[PDB]
């Protein structure tokens, strides 16, 4: 009954234990037998131990009888069995052990009958090959020893108290003699408890801490850590620590984490000398290595343990190991990174107003060649060094003011690192979300977090409204500096400019932006400038007008210059010098950057871009960069005009003008698609895909029937040229590494453009065939895009998608026969790969899918018999089709088999002893 | 026979424990670096079918221009 009560009896373990104690008082043997059977049932065994067994039969024999009397229906036993009732049972089982020790700890524990019986039975069960017995008994023995450790600790405390009482009495006769005798009996009790604890440790622990099952090992490791924490003077020794140190090297990560937590307790307690010095020296390298454990959670715990060790002594960790931990702040795993950032903050940034800490952060960021930006570093240390990271005042003072007596002026590289770090901290404070790869960024901000973010944003705005003009002026020549600094206003509250009467500083900032657009020809600088002007041009903020005015002026000047330049550039007799081309190119780059983010349709710049582009088509000496930026600018002109022409009130004839512009520009992009320079073709193809999507049928789908004239259907030549660009550029020969990654990303975006055309029915589905044929070939490079395209095309038309897949397989087949003779073996890796891709396609079936696959099989057999024997050539393709035979239902199989029998008549079905085996295999599959 | 779990070897032999202590290369790994360049970080966000199929090939920096591409999508 006891097992049932513990399992779900909903009775306090104290009551259960007290009832068992009453039973022990009435008959000790009967209660002992009930306890033995309790442990047996807790292992899952349905047998019962007899009183004769307990009286004479050895524990090993009893265990064997219980194994044969198990009546098990499965391998599950209560401790492994999942479910809330069994979790409650595990907890109640451990509590029963603890309370049983507690209630007997002053008498029955020293009776030396029930305790010895229990330890004997538990040891025997810990030796059992049966995992249920071993597991349950080991957990019970560890819980029992924890309780015994608490009993022995209380005995030691009480002994110290009686010795203190005797000492007081000796200072001052029968009372002190009483006290001496009480100490004597307490020491006898402690020796008895020590015998019990030694029995459990030497008979169970030293055998189960190295158990084959990882669960058992974890139980033992956790409980030895508990003993060390509970009774440090008696269990915090090398004799006990060695087991944790050894099992730190266990291949299983669960056990490793158990070891780490056990150690964390002791290292938190700050005993230091408590054998922890020797353990640290012995296993320091192991902990440092665990910082890079296969299991990330184990690694975080190891880093936290290293921080604890640092709090204990600091210098013990040495600088090399600290640097190992430092590298982890750049890890993709945010837990590891923030633990390492905490370690790094405590190592040097904690001891320290913040100016030297800011300089040290800059120096650390520069010393670590791992990252080129501080986003992930700042993220790692944002929770720890928030006061330092938010000391923007000290940072911009370091960048601005320099003469500070003995302080050495920062190197230009250090100044760039500092503006980078300042920008990253500003961004993380303005938007309370981590950089990509660390946090989702789409989490509802807490009320506290929203208030903190608002305070940081106001401080940033008011400080840098004045700081940023100065910073931009000081670093106007340096391009990276001005880009990073130009990203700051996007994190400002522009209402602060008006409310805080800072309009003068806004004007200075605007003038600085315009100055650097005039000075700079770098694309990133000009992009940052147009982005900043766009952020500042908010009609809802009061500063709009001012900024807008300045914006207009800039454009005006640029436009005028450009026009003049072009008048000389596009002249009947004007051989362009490299300076002339550079002039027109720089002004064009500025105008393109601003036209992307601003409506420059007032300046009517389509004429200039079109003239440049057609002159590049005719003359053929036009600079490639000029063509690229002119393509982009004409694209933006058309786009902005489309945005304007959305109401009949706006215009009607400009709609026709816009249609003409778009068609002409599409022809120009098609011409530049067939260009020698790959970058020109890439720009034209990119813009062309975006144009085709923007001006597709969907341009009228949502209440935009007035835009119905403004549609462009890709002509067959255009579709062919786009697919040819994909085939020539995206799919290439499969072969520093970061440059390869960048190239792969550009190719993926190109492929995704054409695939967007496919999935949104802008182009024919059949084109996708070629893309689909490269699904396995470029699974890593483009397989995600090909998979998404294939699924979308399935949803569009499953029957037509099946046709395109069979076309891809047919394309692989005749490509194989073109590369290698018709003697190709079925085992040849090429044909096997075609069959593998066919299986993959086949996985992609009663929801009209049966109809589509019937059509697929029809096309397959028609292809097989399309080429007849010269004295069927594509008989082999039947094997390919056999990959899809399984998805075909028997009822539909009859019809497709009728078609197949019509193809081979009857003689062929009989003739299959040699190379006709593919036909017979497909015939069987049917 | 019976489904009862009987482990013939209950213990890790001393040789396997010595091997665990001597070589822990199987249980260590290299550092998975977060995006080191700004461009790789931008590709971490912008790249990927979820964003690729919903974003233009030529980046449009004003939401008004982007809205055209997006409204044509689906």
């Amino acid at each position: 009954m006891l097992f049932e009560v513990v399992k779900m009896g909903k009775s306090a373990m104290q009551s259960v234990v007290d009832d068992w104690i009453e039973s022990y008082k009435h008959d000790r043997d009967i209660a002992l037998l009930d306890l033995i059977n309790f442990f047996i049932q807790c292992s899952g065994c349905k047998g019962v131990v007899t009183a004769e067994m307990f009286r004479h039969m050895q524990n090993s024999e009893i265990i064997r009888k219980m194994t044969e009397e198990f009546d098990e229906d499965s391998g599950d036993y209560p401790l492994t069995m999942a479910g809330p009732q069994w979790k409650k049972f595990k907890s109640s089982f451990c509590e029963f052990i603890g309370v049983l020790v507690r209630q007997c700890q002053y008498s029955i524990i020293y009776d030396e009958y029930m305790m010895d019986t229990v330890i004997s039975l538990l040891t025997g069960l810990s030796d059992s090959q049966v995992r249920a017995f071993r597991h349950t008994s080991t957990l019970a023995a560890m819980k029992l020893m924890t309780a015994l450790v608490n009993v022995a600790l209380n005995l030691s405390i009480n002994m110290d108290n009686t010795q203190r009482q005797y000492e007081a009495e000796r200072n001052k006769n029968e009372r002190l003699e009483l006290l001496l005798q009480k100490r004597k009996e307490l020491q006898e009790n402690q020796d008895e408890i020590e015998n019990m604890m030694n029995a459990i440790f030497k008979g169970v622990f030293v055998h189960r801490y190295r158990d084959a099952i990882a669960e058992i090992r974890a139980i033992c490791i956790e409980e030895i850590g508990i003993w060390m924490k509970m009774y440090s003077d008696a269990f915090l020794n090398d004799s006990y620590l060695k087991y944790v140190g050894w099992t730190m090297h266990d291949k299983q990560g669960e056990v490793r984490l158990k070891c780490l937590t056990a150690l964390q307790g002791l290292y938190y307690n700050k005993e230091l000398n408590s054998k922890l010095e020797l353990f640290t020296s012995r296993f320091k390298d192991r902990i440092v290595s665990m910082t890079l454990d296969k299991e990330y959670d184990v690694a975080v715990q190891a880093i936290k343990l290293l921080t604890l060790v640092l709090q204990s002594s600091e210098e013990v960790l040495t600088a090399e190991d600290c640097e190992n931990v430092y590298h982890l702040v750049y890890s993709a795993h945010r837990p590891v990174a923030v633990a390492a950032g905490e370690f790094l903050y405590k190592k040097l940034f904690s001891r320290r107003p913040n100016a030297n800490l800011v300089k040290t952060l800059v120096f650390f960021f520069l010393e670590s060649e791992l990252h080129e930006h501080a986003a992930y570093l700042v993220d790692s240390m944002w929770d720890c060094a928030t006061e330092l990271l938010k000391d923007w005042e000290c940072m911009n003072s370091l960048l601005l003011e320099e003469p500070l007596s003995g302080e050495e002026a920062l190197t230009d590289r250090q100044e760039s690192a500092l503006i980078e770090i300042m920008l990253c901290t500003i961004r993380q404070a303005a938007e309370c979300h981590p950089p990509v790869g660390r946090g989702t960024g789409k989490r509802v901000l807490t009320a506290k977090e929203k208030k903190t973010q608002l305070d940081d944003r106001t401080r940033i705005t008011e400080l840098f409204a004045v700081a940023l003009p100065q910073l931009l002026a000081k670093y106007s020549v340096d391009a990276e500096k001005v880009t990073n600094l130009l990203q700051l206003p996007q994190y400002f509250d522009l209402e602060i400019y008006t409310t805080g009467r800072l309009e003068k500083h806004l004007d200075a900032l605007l003038r600085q932006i315009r100055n650097i657009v005039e000075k700079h020809t770098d694309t990133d600088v000009l992009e940052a400038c147009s982005k900043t002007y766009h952020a500042l041009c908010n009609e809802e903020f009061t500063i709009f007008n001012r900024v807008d005015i300045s914006r207009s002026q800039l454009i005006d000047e640029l436009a005028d210059k450009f026009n003049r330049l072009l008048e000389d550039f596009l002249q009947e007799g004007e051989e362009p010098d490299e300076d002339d081309a550079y002039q027109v190119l720089s002004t064009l780059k500025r105008i393109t950057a601003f036209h992307n983010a601003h409506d420059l349709s007032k300046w009517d710049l389509f004429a200039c871009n079109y003239k440049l582009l057609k002159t590049g088509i005719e003359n053929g000496d036009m600079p490639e960069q000029i063509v690229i930026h002119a393509l982009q600018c004409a694209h933006y002109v058309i786009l902005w005009q489309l945005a304007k022409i959305t109401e009949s009130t706006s215009t009607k004839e400009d709609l026709l003008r816009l249609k003409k512009q778009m068609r002409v520009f599409c022809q120009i992009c098609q011409h530049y698609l067939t260009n020698v320079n790959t970058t020109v073709k890439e720009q034209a193809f990119t813009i062309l895909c975006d144009i085709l999507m923007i001006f597709s049928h969907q341009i009228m789908s949502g209440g935009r029937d007035m835009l119905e004239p403004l549609v462009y259907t890709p002509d067959s030549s255009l579709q062919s040229e786009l697919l040819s660009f994909i085939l020539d550029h995206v799919f290439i020969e499969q072969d520093d590494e970061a440059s390869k990654i960048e190239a792969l990303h550009k190719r993926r975006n190109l492929l995704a453009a054409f695939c967007k055309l496919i999935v949104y029915t802008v182009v024919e589905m059949n084109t996708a065939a070629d893309i689909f044929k490269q699904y396995m070939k470029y699974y890593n490079d483009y397989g995600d895009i090909i998979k998404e395209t294939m699924s979308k095309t399935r949803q569009i038309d499953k029957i037509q998608c099946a046709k395109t897949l069979i076309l891809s397989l047919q394309q692989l087949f005749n490509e194989m026969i073109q590369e290698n003779g018709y003697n190709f073996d079925r085992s040849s890796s090429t044909f096997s790969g075609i069959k593998e891709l066919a299986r993959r396609f086949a996985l992609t079936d009663q929801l009209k899918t049966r109809e589509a696959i019937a059509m697929l099989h029809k096309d397959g057999i028609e292809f097989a018999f399309k080429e007849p024997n010269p004295q069927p050539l594509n008989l082999a393709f039947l094997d390919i089709l056999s990959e899809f035979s399984s998805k075909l239902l028997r009822q539909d199989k009859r019809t497709v088999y009728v078609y197949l029998e019509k193809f081979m008549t009857f003689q062929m079905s009989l003739r299959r002893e040699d190379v006709w085996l593919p036909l017979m295999s497909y015939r069987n599959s049917l | 026979k019976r489904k009862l779990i009987v482990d013939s070897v209950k213990e890790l032999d001393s040789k396997t424990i010595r091997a665990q202590l001597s070589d822990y290369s199987d249980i260590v790994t290299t550092l998975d670096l977060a995006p080191p360049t700004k461009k790789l970080m931008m590709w971490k966000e912008t790249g990927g079918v979820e964003k690729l199929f919903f974003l233009p090939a030529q980046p449009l920096w004003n939401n008004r221009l982007l809205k055209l591409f997006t409204r044509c999508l689906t």
Binding site: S60, D116, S120, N195 | E11
Partner: peptide, 24 residues
């Protein structure tokens, strides 16, 4: 020294009376 691993098992001598392990 204590941390140098020297344990070995499966060659342990079986206890005489498994029923009384606390004998001493």
């Amino acid at each position: 020294d204590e941390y140098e691993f020297d344990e070995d098992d499966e060659q342990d001598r079986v206890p005489p009376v498994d029923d009384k392990h606390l004998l001493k």
